Amino acid sequence: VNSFSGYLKLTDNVYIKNADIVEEAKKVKPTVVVNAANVYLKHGGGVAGALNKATNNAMQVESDDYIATNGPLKVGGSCVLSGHNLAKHCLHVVGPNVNKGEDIQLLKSAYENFNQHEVLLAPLLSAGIFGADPIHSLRVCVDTVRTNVYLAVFDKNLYDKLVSSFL
């Protein structure tokens, strides 16, 4: 049993809810919250800007030190950093950004990072401001992630379309 409440069950391991991942994080304090990161860990807007704002910019400060030491992530890659006030850990995952012309086939590689964690609170990768089709992102999630994932969909209209269209 875990603390996640009000989710619709899509599969054995994937759950979904219309909610802001920042607010969900503040309530649950999950072991892992996933950030919709870019390779530079520049948390300017969407899931990343909102998560970073909720940490009072401490996520950005930590991220800048990570990049100064390690250099940029790969598209499809990830790193584990602090969850600050939101979670124990933040898994920063880089889905492909369609608005930069990145290979959508990298979305499966992105979701494979989730399999290193038994339970996660996450957004739909490459969805939101990353430009991918969220229906596609949910399908890749279900077909890739084997660990237990609690998806927070910020947009109510989109949430209802993801559920209604789910095969």
Ligand X SMILES: NC(=O)c1cccnc1
Interface residue list for ligand X (CB under 6 A): 20-22, 46-47, 50, 128, 154
By beta-carbon proximity to ligand X, the closer residue of 45 and 68 is 45
| Pick 46 or 72: Cβ nearer ligand X | 46
Query: Do 63 and 88 touch, CB atoms closer than 8 A?
Result: no
Distance of alpha carbon 24 from alpha carbon 29, whole angstroms:
8
Give the residue with the Cβ less far from ligand X, 54 or 106: 54
Q: Which of 118, 133 has the CB closer to ligand X?
A: 133
Provide, rounded to whole angstroms, the least separation between the CB of residue 13 and ligand X.
Answer: 22
Quote the least distance from Cβ 51 to ligand X, whole Å.
8
Give min distance, CB of 54 to ligand X, in A: 9
Task: Return contacts of 159-167, CB within 8 angstroms, 24+ apart.
Answer: 159/16, 159/17, 159/18, 160/18, 161/135, 162/16, 162/134, 162/135, 162/138, 163/8, 163/16, 165/135, 166/10, 166/138, 167/139
CB of 92 to ligand X, least distance (A): 15
Q: Which residues pair with 22 in a beta bridge?
A: none
